[PDB]
């Protein structure tokens, strides 16, 4: 019944209140079968809604673009990449024509082309599409909106795949700046963006800068519960009488990361500490 704002370009404005009930049902079935990956049913029904809609309002209409966008994504999941790119451009052309060059639906379609090219390793081609979507999101939502930040994270990983590390660090820091000011410092996106930037640092050999971000994430996590963390204990075990001295999903990964890093550093007692603490945090 409900759908993410990220897939809004696959749905009719508001209800679709004035869309004939037949075309509304036909749309819901296309969506339903495509979810189950049952493309035998999904495609004809889509081709039919497309045919039915072209008769009613012509090819250059927002609803044609909607059914094209749905179909284009079915073709992409079928690994029919060239066909998918064609429909999305056709859908882009219509949306530019009927809704404006800087409409949210346009940004959505560009983010679909960029994803398609990127997942096919055509990062250079994807990059401007992603940047146009970002210039649209800025215009519409404002330069400090969390959705503008979400977009920066996608652009930064697109640039990372091209080794453009100076642009990457900038985008990740701009996105972290937004998620820290516009959202809480204990918002999950803050830790997510930090791990992403830490990954970039790792590529570059900046192990110490990544170690810092892992520690920062693990500190605000502990300080939320009881304002020493697992890593201070790890560093204590690394350095080292009647009885012995016996002893969030975005955090469990950070523990796997810092454990991996300590191991990379050859700090094995500190590594085992976090590696064991990660296995515990998973279960």
mmCIF file of C-alpha atoms in Angstrom:
data_model
loop_
_atom_site.group_PDB
_atom_site.id
_atom_site.type_symbol
_atom_site.label_atom_id
_atom_site.label_comp_id
_atom_site.label_asym_id
_atom_site.label_seq_id
_atom_site.Cartn_x
_atom_site.Cartn_y
_atom_site.Cartn_z
ATOM 1 C CA UNK A 1 0.000 0.000 0.000
ATOM 2 C CA UNK A 2 2.885 2.431 0.895
ATOM 3 C CA UNK A 3 6.054 3.230 -1.134
ATOM 4 C CA UNK A 4 9.344 5.152 -0.436
ATOM 5 C CA UNK A 5 9.725 8.756 -1.754
ATOM 6 C CA UNK A 6 12.728 7.334 -3.701
ATOM 7 C CA UNK A 7 10.341 5.331 -5.945
ATOM 8 C CA UNK A 8 7.736 8.153 -6.244
ATOM 9 C CA UNK A 9 8.582 8.413 -10.016
ATOM 10 C CA UNK A 10 6.910 4.997 -10.439
ATOM 11 C CA UNK A 11 3.546 6.351 -9.185
ATOM 12 C CA UNK A 12 0.808 8.765 -10.394
ATOM 13 C CA UNK A 13 0.460 12.238 -8.732
ATOM 14 C CA UNK A 14 -1.606 12.004 -5.553
ATOM 15 C CA UNK A 15 -4.145 9.245 -5.866
ATOM 16 C CA UNK A 16 -4.290 9.240 -9.648
ATOM 17 C CA UNK A 17 -7.816 10.394 -8.834
ATOM 18 C CA UNK A 18 -8.717 11.210 -12.427
ATOM 19 C CA UNK A 19 -6.866 8.205 -14.018
ATOM 20 C CA UNK A 20 -9.512 5.669 -15.208
ATOM 21 C CA UNK A 21 -9.888 2.898 -12.598
ATOM 22 C CA UNK A 22 -8.767 0.323 -15.229
ATOM 23 C CA UNK A 23 -5.365 2.102 -15.740
ATOM 24 C CA UNK A 24 -4.959 2.488 -11.908
ATOM 25 C CA UNK A 25 -5.566 -1.344 -11.435
ATOM 26 C CA UNK A 26 -3.338 -2.175 -14.419
ATOM 27 C CA UNK A 27 -0.541 0.041 -12.805
ATOM 28 C CA UNK A 28 -0.907 -1.681 -9.405
ATOM 29 C CA UNK A 29 -0.674 -5.147 -11.040
ATOM 30 C CA UNK A 30 2.473 -4.150 -13.003
ATOM 31 C CA UNK A 31 4.059 -2.928 -9.690
ATOM 32 C CA UNK A 32 2.868 -6.138 -7.875
ATOM 33 C CA UNK A 33 4.202 -8.625 -10.376
ATOM 34 C CA UNK A 34 7.474 -6.695 -10.914
ATOM 35 C CA UNK A 35 8.029 -6.879 -7.041
ATOM 36 C CA UNK A 36 7.808 -10.722 -7.219
ATOM 37 C CA UNK A 37 10.176 -10.645 -10.264
ATOM 38 C CA UNK A 38 7.294 -12.323 -12.246
ATOM 39 C CA UNK A 39 8.180 -10.499 -15.509
ATOM 40 C CA UNK A 40 6.028 -12.860 -17.693
ATOM 41 C CA UNK A 41 2.939 -10.950 -16.394
ATOM 42 C CA UNK A 42 4.612 -7.583 -15.548
ATOM 43 C CA UNK A 43 5.772 -6.643 -19.093
ATOM 44 C CA UNK A 44 2.557 -7.298 -21.228
ATOM 45 C CA UNK A 45 0.405 -5.451 -18.638
ATOM 46 C CA UNK A 46 2.870 -2.535 -18.735
ATOM 47 C CA UNK A 47 2.979 -2.531 -22.590
ATOM 48 C CA UNK A 48 -0.851 -2.517 -22.456
ATOM 49 C CA UNK A 49 -1.161 0.390 -19.980
ATOM 50 C CA UNK A 50 1.367 2.246 -22.170
ATOM 51 C CA UNK A 51 -0.708 1.508 -25.321
ATOM 52 C CA UNK A 52 -4.013 2.484 -23.511
ATOM 53 C CA UNK A 53 -2.403 5.768 -22.140
ATOM 54 C CA UNK A 54 -0.903 6.831 -25.542
ATOM 55 C CA UNK A 55 -4.423 6.573 -27.094
ATOM 56 C CA UNK A 56 -5.957 8.789 -24.288
ATOM 57 C CA UNK A 57 -3.308 11.604 -23.942
ATOM 58 C CA UNK A 58 -0.574 10.987 -26.564
ATOM 59 C CA UNK A 59 3.028 9.825 -26.000
ATOM 60 C CA UNK A 60 4.301 13.116 -24.443
ATOM 61 C CA UNK A 61 2.451 12.760 -21.059
ATOM 62 C CA UNK A 62 3.630 12.352 -17.387
ATOM 63 C CA UNK A 63 1.739 8.987 -17.051
ATOM 64 C CA UNK A 64 3.445 7.505 -20.126
ATOM 65 C CA UNK A 65 6.803 8.491 -18.459
ATOM 66 C CA UNK A 66 5.629 6.768 -15.247
ATOM 67 C CA UNK A 67 4.854 3.435 -17.043
ATOM 68 C CA UNK A 68 8.038 3.776 -19.138
ATOM 69 C CA UNK A 69 10.061 4.299 -15.878
ATOM 70 C CA UNK A 70 8.474 1.147 -14.359
ATOM 71 C CA UNK A 71 9.157 -0.899 -17.588
ATOM 72 C CA UNK A 72 12.748 0.484 -17.930
ATOM 73 C CA UNK A 73 13.495 -0.790 -14.425
ATOM 74 C CA UNK A 74 11.999 -4.240 -15.337
ATOM 75 C CA UNK A 75 14.320 -4.394 -18.372
ATOM 76 C CA UNK A 76 17.303 -3.370 -16.095
ATOM 77 C CA UNK A 77 16.515 -6.273 -13.657
ATOM 78 C CA UNK A 78 16.395 -8.565 -16.730
ATOM 79 C CA UNK A 79 19.919 -7.273 -17.668
ATOM 80 C CA UNK A 80 18.490 -5.624 -20.880
ATOM 81 C CA UNK A 81 20.667 -2.536 -20.151
ATOM 82 C CA UNK A 82 20.576 -0.796 -23.587
ATOM 83 C CA UNK A 83 16.687 -1.108 -23.792
ATOM 84 C CA UNK A 84 16.411 0.204 -20.176
ATOM 85 C CA UNK A 85 18.589 3.286 -21.023
ATOM 86 C CA UNK A 86 16.381 4.005 -24.034
ATOM 87 C CA UNK A 87 13.085 3.990 -22.065
ATOM 88 C CA UNK A 88 14.584 6.162 -19.282
ATOM 89 C CA UNK A 89 15.788 8.746 -21.836
ATOM 90 C CA UNK A 90 12.375 8.691 -23.537
ATOM 91 C CA UNK A 91 10.797 9.084 -20.029
ATOM 92 C CA UNK A 92 13.327 11.869 -19.250
ATOM 93 C CA UNK A 93 12.500 13.722 -22.534
ATOM 94 C CA UNK A 94 8.719 13.677 -21.705
ATOM 95 C CA UNK A 95 9.192 14.846 -18.102
ATOM 96 C CA UNK A 96 11.469 17.731 -19.262
ATOM 97 C CA UNK A 97 8.770 18.578 -21.851
ATOM 98 C CA UNK A 98 5.619 18.334 -19.586
ATOM 99 C CA UNK A 99 6.894 19.042 -16.030
ATOM 100 C CA UNK A 100 9.957 21.291 -16.422
ATOM 101 C CA UNK A 101 13.714 20.898 -16.848
ATOM 102 C CA UNK A 102 14.156 21.132 -13.012
ATOM 103 C CA UNK A 103 11.241 19.004 -11.734
ATOM 104 C CA UNK A 104 11.711 16.297 -8.991
ATOM 105 C CA UNK A 105 10.512 13.619 -11.456
ATOM 106 C CA UNK A 106 13.380 14.644 -13.768
ATOM 107 C CA UNK A 107 15.939 14.254 -10.914
ATOM 108 C CA UNK A 108 14.432 10.778 -10.186
ATOM 109 C CA UNK A 109 14.818 9.658 -13.808
ATOM 110 C CA UNK A 110 18.445 10.955 -13.938
ATOM 111 C CA UNK A 111 19.198 9.065 -10.689
ATOM 112 C CA UNK A 112 17.827 5.974 -12.476
ATOM 113 C CA UNK A 113 20.134 6.442 -15.529
ATOM 114 C CA UNK A 114 23.169 7.226 -13.307
ATOM 115 C CA UNK A 115 22.437 4.011 -11.253
ATOM 116 C CA UNK A 116 22.111 1.970 -14.522
ATOM 117 C CA UNK A 117 25.419 3.336 -15.997
ATOM 118 C CA UNK A 118 27.275 3.031 -12.673
ATOM 119 C CA UNK A 119 26.209 -0.594 -12.031
ATOM 120 C CA UNK A 120 27.548 -1.234 -15.618
ATOM 121 C CA UNK A 121 30.826 0.597 -14.752
ATOM 122 C CA UNK A 122 30.225 3.696 -16.964
ATOM 123 C CA UNK A 123 30.925 6.037 -14.017
ATOM 124 C CA UNK A 124 32.188 8.930 -16.240
ATOM 125 C CA UNK A 125 28.859 8.957 -18.182
ATOM 126 C CA UNK A 126 26.750 8.635 -14.968
ATOM 127 C CA UNK A 127 28.627 11.470 -13.126
ATOM 128 C CA UNK A 128 26.971 14.515 -14.932
ATOM 129 C CA UNK A 129 23.455 12.908 -14.648
ATOM 130 C CA UNK A 130 23.983 12.514 -10.876
ATOM 131 C CA UNK A 131 25.270 16.154 -10.691
ATOM 132 C CA UNK A 132 22.179 17.463 -12.617
ATOM 133 C CA UNK A 133 19.851 15.612 -10.178
ATOM 134 C CA UNK A 134 21.835 17.262 -7.343
ATOM 135 C CA UNK A 135 21.463 20.790 -8.916
ATOM 136 C CA UNK A 136 17.674 20.070 -9.184
ATOM 137 C CA UNK A 137 17.428 18.774 -5.563
ATOM 138 C CA UNK A 138 19.294 21.911 -4.352
ATOM 139 C CA UNK A 139 16.896 24.245 -6.308
ATOM 140 C CA UNK A 140 13.773 22.425 -5.015
ATOM 141 C CA UNK A 141 14.648 21.169 -1.478
ATOM 142 C CA UNK A 142 17.320 23.785 -0.567
ATOM 143 C CA UNK A 143 21.179 23.355 -0.425
ATOM 144 C CA UNK A 144 21.048 22.053 3.222
ATOM 145 C CA UNK A 145 18.273 19.436 2.924
ATOM 146 C CA UNK A 146 18.984 15.786 4.093
ATOM 147 C CA UNK A 147 17.908 14.550 0.608
ATOM 148 C CA UNK A 148 20.592 16.848 -0.912
ATOM 149 C CA UNK A 149 23.051 15.113 1.511
ATOM 150 C CA UNK A 150 21.760 11.596 0.495
ATOM 151 C CA UNK A 151 22.490 12.618 -3.140
ATOM 152 C CA UNK A 152 26.044 13.821 -2.163
ATOM 153 C CA UNK A 153 26.813 10.339 -0.739
ATOM 154 C CA UNK A 154 25.788 8.809 -4.161
ATOM 155 C CA UNK A 155 27.852 11.340 -6.115
ATOM 156 C CA UNK A 156 30.845 10.841 -3.828
ATOM 157 C CA UNK A 157 30.793 6.995 -4.441
ATOM 158 C CA UNK A 158 30.407 7.619 -8.186
ATOM 159 C CA UNK A 159 33.549 9.913 -8.077
ATOM 160 C CA UNK A 160 35.372 7.345 -5.766
ATOM 161 C CA UNK A 161 35.041 4.706 -8.499
ATOM 162 C CA UNK A 162 36.947 7.202 -10.791
ATOM 163 C CA UNK A 163 39.702 7.897 -8.168
ATOM 164 C CA UNK A 164 38.653 11.613 -7.893
ATOM 165 C CA UNK A 165 39.398 11.507 -4.082
ATOM 166 C CA UNK A 166 39.570 15.336 -3.630
ATOM 167 C CA UNK A 167 35.925 15.732 -4.914
ATOM 168 C CA UNK A 168 34.908 12.580 -2.868
ATOM 169 C CA UNK A 169 36.187 13.979 0.480
ATOM 170 C CA UNK A 170 34.458 17.309 -0.237
ATOM 171 C CA UNK A 171 31.034 15.716 -1.003
ATOM 172 C CA UNK A 172 31.236 13.375 1.995
ATOM 173 C CA UNK A 173 32.097 16.293 4.295
ATOM 174 C CA UNK A 174 29.273 18.458 2.788
ATOM 175 C CA UNK A 175 26.818 15.559 3.383
ATOM 176 C CA UNK A 176 28.178 15.012 6.943
ATOM 177 C CA UNK A 177 27.833 18.788 7.597
ATOM 178 C CA UNK A 178 24.100 18.617 6.534
ATOM 179 C CA UNK A 179 23.323 15.432 8.541
ATOM 180 C CA UNK A 180 24.999 16.932 11.662
ATOM 181 C CA UNK A 181 23.326 20.411 11.578
ATOM 182 C CA UNK A 182 19.896 19.499 9.971
ATOM 183 C CA UNK A 183 19.632 16.168 11.896
ATOM 184 C CA UNK A 184 20.829 14.896 15.289
ATOM 185 C CA UNK A 185 24.527 14.139 15.997
ATOM 186 C CA UNK A 186 23.101 10.673 17.016
ATOM 187 C CA UNK A 187 21.172 10.271 13.692
ATOM 188 C CA UNK A 188 22.132 6.980 11.883
ATOM 189 C CA UNK A 189 23.070 8.856 8.650
ATOM 190 C CA UNK A 190 25.928 10.618 10.523
ATOM 191 C CA UNK A 191 27.613 7.224 11.332
ATOM 192 C CA UNK A 192 26.780 5.935 7.805
ATOM 193 C CA UNK A 193 28.434 8.985 6.103
ATOM 194 C CA UNK A 194 31.429 8.657 8.469
ATOM 195 C CA UNK A 195 32.024 4.985 7.477
ATOM 196 C CA UNK A 196 31.718 5.947 3.780
ATOM 197 C CA UNK A 197 34.402 8.676 4.146
ATOM 198 C CA UNK A 198 36.486 6.222 6.201
ATOM 199 C CA UNK A 199 36.327 3.765 3.227
ATOM 200 C CA UNK A 200 37.615 6.544 0.912
ATOM 201 C CA UNK A 201 40.509 7.197 3.387
ATOM 202 C CA UNK A 202 41.265 3.419 3.351
ATOM 203 C CA UNK A 203 41.496 3.377 -0.533
ATOM 204 C CA UNK A 204 44.014 6.285 -0.238
ATOM 205 C CA UNK A 205 46.180 4.698 2.501
ATOM 206 C CA UNK A 206 44.982 7.285 5.083
ATOM 207 C CA UNK A 207 44.583 4.490 7.748
ATOM 208 C CA UNK A 208 44.992 6.917 10.686
ATOM 209 C CA UNK A 209 42.225 9.294 9.386
ATOM 210 C CA UNK A 210 39.858 6.268 8.965
ATOM 211 C CA UNK A 211 40.881 4.920 12.501
ATOM 212 C CA UNK A 212 39.775 8.323 13.868
ATOM 213 C CA UNK A 213 36.266 8.143 12.262
ATOM 214 C CA UNK A 214 35.777 4.546 13.454
ATOM 215 C CA UNK A 215 36.715 5.639 17.023
ATOM 216 C CA UNK A 216 34.464 8.824 16.762
ATOM 217 C CA UNK A 217 31.430 6.614 15.724
ATOM 218 C CA UNK A 218 32.135 4.114 18.556
ATOM 219 C CA UNK A 219 32.597 6.970 21.094
ATOM 220 C CA UNK A 220 29.244 8.910 20.522
ATOM 221 C CA UNK A 221 27.608 5.374 20.626
ATOM 222 C CA UNK A 222 29.036 4.558 24.137
ATOM 223 C CA UNK A 223 28.562 8.195 25.426
ATOM 224 C CA UNK A 224 24.816 7.796 24.411
ATOM 225 C CA UNK A 225 24.534 4.732 26.759
ATOM 226 C CA UNK A 226 26.960 5.809 29.654
ATOM 227 C CA UNK A 227 28.527 9.315 29.050
ATOM 228 C CA UNK A 228 35.854 3.521 28.426
ATOM 229 C CA UNK A 229 34.755 2.221 24.889
ATOM 230 C CA UNK A 230 35.690 -1.241 23.399
ATOM 231 C CA UNK A 231 38.649 0.336 21.500
ATOM 232 C CA UNK A 232 40.269 1.797 24.644
ATOM 233 C CA UNK A 233 40.038 -1.714 26.143
ATOM 234 C CA UNK A 234 41.455 -3.115 22.855
ATOM 235 C CA UNK A 235 44.464 -0.710 23.002
ATOM 236 C CA UNK A 236 44.907 -1.661 26.739
ATOM 237 C CA UNK A 237 44.998 -5.460 25.879
ATOM 238 C CA UNK A 238 47.509 -4.691 23.035
ATOM 239 C CA UNK A 239 49.988 -2.833 25.366
ATOM 240 C CA UNK A 240 49.723 -5.710 27.987
ATOM 241 C CA UNK A 241 47.275 -11.059 41.272
ATOM 242 C CA UNK A 242 45.246 -13.322 43.751
ATOM 243 C CA UNK A 243 42.499 -13.988 41.096
ATOM 244 C CA UNK A 244 43.022 -13.248 37.397
ATOM 245 C CA UNK A 245 41.764 -10.271 35.398
ATOM 246 C CA UNK A 246 38.690 -12.116 33.938
ATOM 247 C CA UNK A 247 35.977 -10.482 31.737
ATOM 248 C CA UNK A 248 22.660 -0.270 16.302
ATOM 249 C CA UNK A 249 23.347 -2.127 12.974
ATOM 250 C CA UNK A 250 25.548 0.817 11.749
ATOM 251 C CA UNK A 251 27.815 0.275 14.828
ATOM 252 C CA UNK A 252 28.277 -3.577 14.402
ATOM 253 C CA UNK A 253 29.907 -2.858 10.983
ATOM 254 C CA UNK A 254 32.113 -0.064 12.478
ATOM 255 C CA UNK A 255 33.277 -2.737 14.977
ATOM 256 C CA UNK A 256 34.024 -5.150 12.043
ATOM 257 C CA UNK A 257 35.904 -2.226 10.348
ATOM 258 C CA UNK A 258 38.098 -1.057 13.255
ATOM 259 C CA UNK A 259 38.806 -4.743 14.038
ATOM 260 C CA UNK A 260 39.864 -5.299 10.393
ATOM 261 C CA UNK A 261 42.018 -2.053 10.594
ATOM 262 C CA UNK A 262 43.745 -3.043 13.870
ATOM 263 C CA UNK A 263 44.474 -6.426 12.151
ATOM 264 C CA UNK A 264 45.765 -4.516 9.080
ATOM 265 C CA UNK A 265 48.064 -2.523 11.475
ATOM 266 C CA UNK A 266 49.490 -5.794 12.934
ATOM 267 C CA UNK A 267 47.870 -4.920 16.337
ATOM 268 C CA UNK A 268 46.469 -8.457 16.868
ATOM 269 C CA UNK A 269 45.427 -8.390 20.611
ATOM 270 C CA UNK A 270 43.430 -5.144 19.857
ATOM 271 C CA UNK A 271 42.098 -6.806 16.644
ATOM 272 C CA UNK A 272 40.866 -9.991 18.371
ATOM 273 C CA UNK A 273 39.140 -7.759 21.021
ATOM 274 C CA UNK A 274 36.954 -5.957 18.405
ATOM 275 C CA UNK A 275 36.613 -9.093 16.155
ATOM 276 C CA UNK A 276 35.138 -10.976 19.175
ATOM 277 C CA UNK A 277 33.065 -7.867 20.111
ATOM 278 C CA UNK A 278 31.699 -7.759 16.514
ATOM 279 C CA UNK A 279 30.619 -11.489 16.609
ATOM 280 C CA UNK A 280 28.813 -10.719 19.950
ATOM 281 C CA UNK A 281 27.152 -7.516 18.499
ATOM 282 C CA UNK A 282 25.965 -9.511 15.365
ATOM 283 C CA UNK A 283 24.319 -12.250 17.608
#
